[PDB]
């Protein structure tokens, strides 16, 4: 899983020994809904279900794909 790997990497294209067949972008709050930050956990993942803890998850396969920030259309 060579994407935005934070498994001992600063958002770096590393094939993570911790995790499974998905690339993360596990993002939520967004002011960390208090005193300003963007909680993006970059977790090498098995599946992104429909019935999830409702966060904006760009659950990609591999090859960079899914970066930290708000994946917002220009």
């Amino acid at each position: 899983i060579v994407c935005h790997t934070t498994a001992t990497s600063p958002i770096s294209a590393v094939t993570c020994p911790p995790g499974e067949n998905l690339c993360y972008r596990k993002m939520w709050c967004d002011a960390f809904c208090s005193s300003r930050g963007k909680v993006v956990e970059l977790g090498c993942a098995a599946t992104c279900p429909s019935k999830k803890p409702y966060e904006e998850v760009t659950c990609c396969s591999t090859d960079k794909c899914n970066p930290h920030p708000k994946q917002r259309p220009g």
């Binding site: 995790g19 909680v39 970059l42």
Partner: peptide
């Protein structure tokens, strides 16, 4: 073993 970035 994964990190939060802000």
């Amino acid at each position: 073993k994964h990190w939060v970035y802000y």
